[PDB]
Amino acid sequence: NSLLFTAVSWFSIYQFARKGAVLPVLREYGRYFGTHRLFRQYLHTLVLPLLYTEYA
Amino acid sequence: WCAYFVPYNIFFKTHMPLEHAYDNLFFPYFQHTHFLWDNNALHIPTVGGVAIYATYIALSYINNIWKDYVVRAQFSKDKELLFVTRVSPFGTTEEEVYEVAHLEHLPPSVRSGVKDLSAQDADGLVDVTCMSSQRSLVFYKGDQYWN
């Protein structure tokens, strides 16, 4: 389930950004490293479902 | 499918009934066969008549439902008799004529229902009611289709 959610999120992010649609849930430009919102969202999507499954 | 193909196999190609057949009956289990039922076969004529009438009713109802929309329209040379081709029962086109004075568009009988009217939308439907025959021509309320 976590892998399916992560894959769906990655594909949706890539496709929506290919048309410009980007959710600014995090900062558009992060502090320090200044990573893009897209990269930060990709990292968060990779990280979160594993943590949730681990907790449950 | 839901009426014949499934019933044909479910009634004549098995001996175990469906789970829906025994869920309500508290009786010992048994198998069913079609060679020892209705020796005086009144069920055969009943099934045949039911199937014929149901198919006829379904066709007539589909034709009536699809027969209110307007598929093609053409005002006459004097625009007195508008020739319109609607959907025929066999899926073809059927041509009729309507008198200019017959068609009209009027507010609904419940004035409070105006806001809930189909024509209120920009890409909706507008019904011209030929009052002579009490007929309806449902034109597509949109600019692209009209001349």
């Binding site: - | 014929i52 198919t55 006829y56 066709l59 007539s60 034709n63 066999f90």
Partner: protein, 149 residues
């Protein structure tokens, strides 16, 4: 030999393109020139006036539509063998019908009986019957449509 080299360079060329995309920004500002009082952007080997980004996208869409429908809208004109054959068959049938009914009077026995009845609501036929042959067949087809299947 050349295609083997090309296949070897396929991941190589793709990697080079990826490196170029990474090391290059999609911004050059080398297209828009103010031609006299008209702002024209480089369009292929020439210029094209730009009023809005939406306008430029619309012009591109129109050109793309022209290019995509170029071949199909260049359909063969005089490929009319089947249509001509259909027209000829219909004309031949109509001519045979007109020949078979060249010299028949309009009124029939019923029409004669129509002259000996009080049925003034029904009217006597007074026109040619060619245009409405097999209207009974049409009515039979209408009546059997809801009962055939």
């Amino acid at each position: 030999f050349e295609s083997l080299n090309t296949v070897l360079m396929a991941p190589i060329y793709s990697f080079l393109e990826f490196k170029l995309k990474l090391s290059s920004t999609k911004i050059n500002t080398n297209h828009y020139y103010v031609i006299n009082g008209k702002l024209y952007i480089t369009y292929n080997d020439s210029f094209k006036l730009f009023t809005t980004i939406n306008d430029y996208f619309n012009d591109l869409n129109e050109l793309s539509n022209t290019k995509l429908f170029f071949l199909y809208r260049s359909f063969n004109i005089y490929n009319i063998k089947l249509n001509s054959l259909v027209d000829f068959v219909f004309l031949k049938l109509i001519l045979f019908i007109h020949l078979l009914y060249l010299k028949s009077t309009n009124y029939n026995r019923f029409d004669y009986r129509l002259k000996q009845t009080d049925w003034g609501f029904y009217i006597n036929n007074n026109s040619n019957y060619i245009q409405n042959i097999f209207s009974g067949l049409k009515y039979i087809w209408r009546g059997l449509r809801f009962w055939i299947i």
